[PDB]
Amino acid sequence: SRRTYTLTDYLKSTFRVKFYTLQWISDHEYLYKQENNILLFNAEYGNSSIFLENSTFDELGYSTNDYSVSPDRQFILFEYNYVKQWRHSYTASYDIYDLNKRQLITEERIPNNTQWITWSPVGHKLAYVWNNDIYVKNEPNLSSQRITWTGKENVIYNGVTDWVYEEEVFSAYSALWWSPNGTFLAYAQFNDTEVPLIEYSFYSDESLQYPKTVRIPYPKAGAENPTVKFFVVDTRTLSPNASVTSYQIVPPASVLIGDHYLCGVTWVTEERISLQWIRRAQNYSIIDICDYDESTGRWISSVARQHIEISTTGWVGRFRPAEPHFTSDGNSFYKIISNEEGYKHICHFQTDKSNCTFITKGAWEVIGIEALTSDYLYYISNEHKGMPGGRNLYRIQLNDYTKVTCLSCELNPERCQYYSASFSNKAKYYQLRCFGPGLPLYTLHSSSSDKELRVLEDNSALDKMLQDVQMPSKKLDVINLHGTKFWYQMILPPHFDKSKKYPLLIEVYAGPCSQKVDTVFRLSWATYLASTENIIVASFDGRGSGYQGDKIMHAINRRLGTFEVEDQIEATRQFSKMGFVDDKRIAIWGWSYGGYVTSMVLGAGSGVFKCGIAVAPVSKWEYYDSVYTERYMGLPTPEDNLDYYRNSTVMSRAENFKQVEYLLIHGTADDNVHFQQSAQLSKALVDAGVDFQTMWYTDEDHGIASNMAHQHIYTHMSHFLKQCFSLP
Amino acid sequence: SRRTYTLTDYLKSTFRVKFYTLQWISDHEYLYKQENNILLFNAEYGNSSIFLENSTFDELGYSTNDYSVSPDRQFILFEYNYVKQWRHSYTASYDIYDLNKRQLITEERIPNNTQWITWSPVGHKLAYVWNNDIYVKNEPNLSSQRITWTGKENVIYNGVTDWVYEEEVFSAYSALWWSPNGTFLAYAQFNDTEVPLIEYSFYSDESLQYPKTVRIPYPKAGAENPTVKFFVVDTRTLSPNASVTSYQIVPPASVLIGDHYLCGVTWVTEERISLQWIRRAQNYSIIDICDYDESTGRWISSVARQHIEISTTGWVGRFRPAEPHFTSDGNSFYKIISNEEGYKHICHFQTDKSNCTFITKGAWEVIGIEALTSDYLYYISNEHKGMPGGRNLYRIQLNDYTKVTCLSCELNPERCQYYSASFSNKAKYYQLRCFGPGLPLYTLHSSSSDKELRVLEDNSALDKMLQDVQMPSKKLDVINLHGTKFWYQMILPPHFDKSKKYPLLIEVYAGPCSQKVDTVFRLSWATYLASTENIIVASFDGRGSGYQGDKIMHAINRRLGTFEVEDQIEATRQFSKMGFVDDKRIAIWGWSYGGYVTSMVLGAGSGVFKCGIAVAPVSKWEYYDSVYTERYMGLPTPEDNLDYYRNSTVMSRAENFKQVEYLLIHGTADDNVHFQQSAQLSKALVDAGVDFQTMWYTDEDHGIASNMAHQHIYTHMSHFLKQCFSLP
Ligand SMILES: *[C@@H]1O[C@H](CO)[C@@H](O[C@@H]2O[C@H](CO)[C@@H](O[C@@H]3O[C@H](CO)[C@@H](O)[C@H](O)[C@@H]3O)[C@H](O)[C@H]2NC(C)=O)[C@H](O)[C@H]1NC(C)=O
Ligand SMILES: *[C@@H]1O[C@H](CO)[C@@H](O[C@@H]2O[C@H](CO)[C@@H](O)[C@H](O)[C@H]2NC(C)=O)[C@H](O)[C@H]1NC(C)=O
Ligand SMILES: *[C@@H]1O[C@H](CO)[C@@H](O[C@@H]2O[C@H](CO)[C@@H](O)[C@H](O)[C@H]2NC(C)=O)[C@H](O)[C@H]1NC(C)=O
Ligand SMILES: *[C@@H]1O[C@H](CO)[C@@H](O[C@@H]2O[C@H](CO)[C@@H](O)[C@H](O)[C@H]2NC(C)=O)[C@H](O)[C@H]1NC(C)=O
Ligand SMILES: *[C@](=O)([N][C]([C]([C])[C][C])C([O])=O)[C]1[C][C][C]N1C(=O)[C]([N])C([C])([C])[C]
Ligand SMILES: *[C@](=O)([N][C]([C]([C])[C][C])C([O])=O)[C]1[C][C][C]N1C(=O)[C]([N])C([C])([C])[C]
Ligand SMILES: *[C@@H]1O[C@H](CO)[C@@H](O)[C@H](O)[C@H]1NC(C)=O
Ligand SMILES: *[C@@H]1O[C@H](CO)[C@@H](O)[C@H](O)[C@H]1NC(C)=O
Ligand SMILES: *[C@@H]1O[C@H](CO)[C@@H](O)[C@H](O)[C@H]1NC(C)=O
Numbered sequence A, B: 001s002r003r004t005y006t007l008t009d010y011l012k013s014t015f016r017v018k019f020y021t022l023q024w025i026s027d028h029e030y031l032y033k034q035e036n037n038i039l040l041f042n043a044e045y046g047n048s049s050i051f052l053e054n055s056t057f058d059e060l061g062y063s064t065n066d067y068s069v070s071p072d073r074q075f076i077l078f079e080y081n082y083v084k085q086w087r088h089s090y091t092a093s094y095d096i097y098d099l100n101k102r103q104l105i106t107e108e109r110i111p112n113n114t115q116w117i118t119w120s121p122v123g124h125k126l127a128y129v130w131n132n133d134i135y136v137k138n139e140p141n142l143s144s145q146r147i148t149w150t151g152k153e154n155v156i157y158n159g160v161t162d163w164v165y166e167e168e169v170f171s172a173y174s175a176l177w178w179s180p181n182g183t184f185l186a187y188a189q190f191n192d193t194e195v196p197l198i199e200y201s202f203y204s205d206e207s208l209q210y211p212k213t214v215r216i217p218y219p220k221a222g223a224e225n226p227t228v229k230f231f232v233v234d235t236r237t238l239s240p241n242a243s244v245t246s247y248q249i250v251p252p253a254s255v256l257i258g259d260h261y262l263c264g265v266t267w268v269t270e271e272r273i274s275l276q277w278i279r280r281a282q283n284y285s286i287i288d289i290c291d292y293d294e295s296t297g298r299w300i301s302s303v304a305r306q307h308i309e310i311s312t313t314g315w316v317g318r319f320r321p322a323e324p325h326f327t328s329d330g331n332s333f334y335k336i337i338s339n340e341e342g343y344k345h346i347c348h349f350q351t352d353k354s355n356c357t358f359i360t361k362g363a364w365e366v367i368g369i370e371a372l373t374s375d376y377l378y379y380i381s382n383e384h385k386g387m388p389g390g391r392n393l394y395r396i397q398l399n400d401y402t403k404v405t406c407l408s409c410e411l412n413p414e415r416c417q418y419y420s421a422s423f424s425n426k427a428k429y430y431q432l433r434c435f436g437p438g439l440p441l442y443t444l445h446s447s448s449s450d451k452e453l454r455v456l457e458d459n460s461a462l463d464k465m466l467q468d469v470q471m472p473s474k475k476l477d478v479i480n481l482h483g484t485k486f487w488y489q490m491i492l493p494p495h496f497d498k499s500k501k502y503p504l505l506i507e508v509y510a511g512p513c514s515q516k517v518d519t520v521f522r523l524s525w526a527t528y529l530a531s532t533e534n535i536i537v538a539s540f541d542g543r544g545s546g547y548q549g550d551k552i553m554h555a556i557n558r559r560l561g562t563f564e565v566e567d568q569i570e571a572t573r574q575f576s577k578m579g580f581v582d583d584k585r586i587a588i589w590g591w592s593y594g595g596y597v598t599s600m601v602l603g604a605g606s607g608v609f610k611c612g613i614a615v616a617p618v619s620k621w622e623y624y625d626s627v628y629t630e631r632y633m634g635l636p637t638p639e640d641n642l643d644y645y646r647n648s649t650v651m652s653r654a655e656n657f658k659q660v661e662y663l664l665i666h667g668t669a670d671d672n673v674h675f676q677q678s679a680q681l682s683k684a685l686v687d688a689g690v691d692f693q694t695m696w697y698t699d700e701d702h703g704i705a706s707n708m709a710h711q712h713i714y715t716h717m718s719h720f721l722k723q724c725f726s727l728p
């Protein structure tokens, strides 16, 4: 032991962090690929069998990047030819393989460039999008049936979301919802017709003589937004000589009154669907439980079956209103909302009664509802030890909201404080995912006795390797800002010599409801900066950060770039007091919102930071998309919030950049935070006679994730810092 | 003690070089803008008189950008609202001012956004281009008369060149020619229909919410070219209810067979016009002298009046074929072409015969024909002292080609070695223009006595200032590369100590027919680098450079990126052995071609250069336009030259960049050398795993000439250099 975790170690993932991904297919069975083959595991016994031998894989075209077995287990989809688009969207090619005959369906095949596809909840029907249109195949070998015709590229989307619904509302490309029994197929249609286009250049491969102009309908703050239509389709009459039987469900008057967004779709029963709408302003949402009128095919609404959720201090939900979780019968539902105290907690609702009943209370928050049985509700909260940066699995007894137990809490207190969970079909079993502070740990549990059962993956191999390398230690602690207790974390160099004054790297994000301080174990660039370069890396969650009540999270409502920016400065200032830090060598970096914050900070003139790096930063909110931007800023109009839109640009702080060293980076093909943002920032700094460095990344997106590009930016950033800290 | 020439000195233009711009308006008078007044000087006795006083300009209400007095001196044209387009093109608004009633014309005014305007050669007639169509105004107060109706944006161009003809053929936006007495108005039409569009983003001013996308029909190597047509309009028939009587002159068959370019137009007499065409291949051009047939109104050609010019070792002319200069009768003309030995000299052509007789010869070249009378021919050449980097005015006796005088070689030998001239009508007088080695100096002379009438400007003011400051010296000399002597130049720091060792900076261009080594006086970025930073800045003209005959200039024919690149490396390799050069601190920088050569040099792996800076570099010839590129490289096909097109990209040498500090700089709005070029190059490097520094300049065009931008790039390059050279 005399070697340290290096940039190459981090760049090449020399140290492998293993995990264990399974797929429940029953209340007691899951599918797990091991050594390339799909094995069927029995949760109860641990004994397994073969479902699909590796070798059944005959590199069709390229290779199998994902599979999907149909619910009746008679078939299985093979995803290959993957071709990414946006964060979640992508096209692919599919093969349907008959498990009975263990054959490969060869007639009536799924198209090339398929946008989205999915089995029905039961059986093996198939719905898929292609060229913005919907298709249904009741039988793999049988011919498909075209559902929509309006499908137009960059104009009409049926079955899949457009750019803003993908990135800002559903965090999915998918906009298809099979009914529980497959009778109905729900979908949304998005109309981008009047949505302005962001246009940037994509240079493609060196062989391309002329660059290509990418054009995406992307609504910026205040611009015209796309419109939505919801339809429920009765797949029963789907026949080639029959038309399509579909009903359009509109939002309740209170929202149909103006621009809005469809943000949630939840089937309760085969004849009950739950629509979640929110206004453009996004501080007013509403759940509409619609009932199927057998005698007419209509889907009906009722004032009594509607539930309003609003915010006066900000926006509804974290990034969107929390989803409703209905009881089997569908007469009541449990959903997370804010207290009178402003804490995200579970409230029990009655399908047709407006009053709800919180079943959880506390100065902490429910992160999410994972499972619901006829007796119990399973959820995840950051309650344990009152530290918001941790997560745990809790079970509450429905007949007595006093009987609430914590399953993950004491399993491995030192190694596990951050969990997520996956439950079997009828919540009879569940896998616990431990992500830190110690090495990840995957285990299988039986809901009956919460018995350990077995350890799926302990990363024992990874633990071995790391005992030879000089790893940094990660500590989390609090500090007091204007009365409030806020959390921070510091990755400290090995053999920490307290007499020495270490340089400081503040890694920031600071976006609304963001959380940079947690107990998640990571092998990041910071690890390298501390293990090898003896640089201390810290992060701070202040006003604006989430998982700590609305009072904190909403602090920056309608005023982005203010309190979250300032709290980073005061937090750092406090830190610069600790004896082991060289207050004359403090840098700050961030990506996206972190790049914005970092910029605002450098241009703050606090004289606190010597240099910073902004990767793909927002620079002027009017340049960002309407759904996200407005959710926190409202409209950039003088009758509303124009003033705070203008005094929050980075450009407005240009003059102050003369006091520090700044590295501005940005992918030229960033559909998310358009390259423009940085182009406008640099031009401003140039007008201000301010010197600084830049690094553009040709054809890389918001992720700058291509192999060569990933390695480069981190290598570059690393020298800039060393250069800034006068390091060897 | 003394002061040095500082960066701020160069950027702010603290030391202003003065000059004298006059406009001959007759055989003995010339206009001159003094104190914003327009003075009319009489060259005979030097007495002046006011032509238009600044009073007039105070009264206009807009910043006058320029004016143009009608030949008959009755009207003056005022130009305002100048809006730059490409290197030469631009649009503007125009006022016509009456010089008698000294009243501004306000009836039937000239359109805004006028692309081109010109008075006829006599009288006060006008011709202008608006919306790609031509118009003619006989009188300033009467309505104009539309000539063409085909004007179409980005498609059809009447009276003005397209982008490629503008940048590469005419070095002018203008594409119309009045006959001597204004009888005919000839123009060219360009069809860009099938020319591909280069597209790129222009973010504009910070407040634009969506970047705009600029589309320019621009042909790249091998792509489809614009086509052209030439017409001669008989303006005598112009009249509201009359059609436009015009005639179309097509190139001779030898050029018509395939792709060609109109490259020269020269009126000879009212009835004789000279067109110069050249094949797309550019090693074959022809002059076609057409005569007006009074009986039918057409312009006839004849094989007798055709003159071919071809190059078997490379291309014709320097950046186009030289222009013919006709005698007053048009029965003969004089033009520069390569002689048997490969040196460009003047040949006397018989308008109706094919053989020509050389009136000049030697191992030097005539730069151009300046004036021509029935008795003498005046020209410029680098003959004096046998130094190509020098320019002098010579007069040759038309009746005895052995009798040649050098009118400016001895005037001020030590102070002046680089001259340019400007003769009056009939060449009775001429202003001499000395640009170095000493402070520029403007003088007037008589042609009959060759007496130095008077001094127009000697820059004594500048001289005064430079006295108190420590300027650098510019030594010029020679060396040998493969048995040939090439010239180089060095900008040495003050108190140059042959003893001490200095860091060297190679400033390079090295493009075909270029001359980076001359005796011109320049207050440049290099002046500060030597004066204040004591850095030696050297330039070298090796193979491919011009003004030294075709053997040197055509050496790189069809193989750009080879000898010229190689020669800079050998040259430097020698400079380093000179003892006053510190071989541990050598760098190279260039712009455009220089950026390309610079890049190829660093990619060579010569171990010679430590760091380098490329600005707006070409990186792959298939990315540059057709006219320029094909001229030296041919077509990028395998039946032709694709092989050399491929192994000559900067990307092909990326692997070697791992050994040098590189700085890539480009303006995102560069319409000449597209941003694409540096984007593909940065992409190659990232892939090869090369670290380097970058810098883009938002909305800056090929010259990165906006003010702040200009200051910013030099400031940025200075720190880079100094950082490379270990200079505080
Ligand atoms: C309009 O025209 C009048 C001339 O009739 C201009 O006045 C002249 O302006 C120049 C420039 O300032 C003066 O020259 C100065 O000379 C001194 C000599 O020591 C020199 O030190 C300065 O650097 C400068 O060159 C000139 O004397 C003056 N002559 C007159 C008539 O007073 C006037 O500037 C013009 N106004 C406009 C609209 O520009
Ligand atoms: C998408 O929305 C646009 C409106 O933005 C619809 O366009 C209108 O269509 C109607 C009938 O087709 C016309 O009468 C209007 O003149 C159109 N307005 C505009 C601005 O185009 C379009 O029909 C919608 N598309 C779908 C399939 O819903
Ligand atoms: C935009 O302007 C507002 C007010 O004009 C800024 O808010 C003020 O911030 C100072 C701290 O510097 C406080 O002392 C004031 O009380 C604040 N005023 C209000 C009305 O809250 C805000 O910080 C600016 N935002 C940005 C991005 O600079
Ligand atoms: C492209 O390839 C050609 C041919 O291989 C190169 O030319 C040769 O270069 C070698 C090595 O420098 C010389 O020794 C030969 O004399 C050259 N022969 C020929 C056929 O020219 C050329 O230099 C390459 N060009 C580039 C851009 O690297
Ligand atoms: C930026 O912050 N995006 C970041 C987020 C996702 C890091 C957690 C990134 O790297 O993609 C931008 C600017 C602020 C909003 N933002 C977004 O991309 C948003 N659409 C979210 C919801 C993805 C943050
Ligand atoms: C390059 O040379 N651009 C330079 C030239 C004009 C310096 C003399 C610049 O600063 O504009 C580019 C790339 C090679 C060809 N070139 C051109 O611009 C050419 N069209 C010429 C004919 C202007 C050199
Ligand atoms: C596990 O073993 C039991 C026999 O006790 C069997 O019924 C079951 O199918 C097995 N499960 C698998 C998939 O191995
Ligand atoms: C398939 O699984 C077997 C175990 O049964 C394993 O030995 C073999 O390596 C696997 N083949 C691969 C690598 O696809
Ligand atoms: C559906 O229409 C097609 C039209 O070609 C016809 O051939 C087919 O018989 C129809 N289906 C039935 C049997 O209704």
Ligand SMILES: *[C@@H]1O[C@H](CO)[C@@H](O)[C@H](O)[C@H]1NC(C)=O
Binding pocket: A281, A283, A310, A311, A312, A313, A634, A635, A640
């Ligand atoms: C919702 O936000 C908008 C912001 O434009 C505001 O006008 C409206 O009053 C808000 N309503 C509530 C209940 O806060």
Ligand SMILES: *[C@@H]1O[C@H](CO)[C@@H](O)[C@H](O)[C@H]1NC(C)=O
Binding pocket: B040, B041, B042, B045, B047, B048, B049
């Ligand atoms: C110069 O003086 C002569 C007098 O011989 C006169 O004819 C001429 O017009 C004058 N020109 C100017 C510029 O005053």
Ligand SMILES: *[C@@H]1O[C@H](CO)[C@@H](O)[C@H](O)[C@H]1NC(C)=O
Binding pocket: B150, B156, B191, B193, B194
């Ligand atoms: C321009 O060229 C296109 C084909 O290249 C032709 O069809 C068109 O008619 C031409 N237009 C003119 C005005 O010459």
Ligand SMILES: *[C@@H]1O[C@H](CO)[C@@H](O)[C@H](O)[C@H]1NC(C)=O
Binding pocket: B239, B240, B241
């Ligand atoms: C030109 O024609 C118009 C109508 O077409 C008429 O009013 C005018 O008088 C004519 N003028 C001439 C020059 O004949």
Ligand SMILES: *[C@@H]1O[C@H](CO)[C@@H](O)[C@H](O)[C@H]1NC(C)=O
Binding pocket: B281, B283, B284, B310, B311, B312, B313, B634
């Ligand atoms: C002119 O160029 C073409 C193609 O580049 C070539 O084939 C032809 O031989 C050249 N002509 C001369 C005089 O060399």
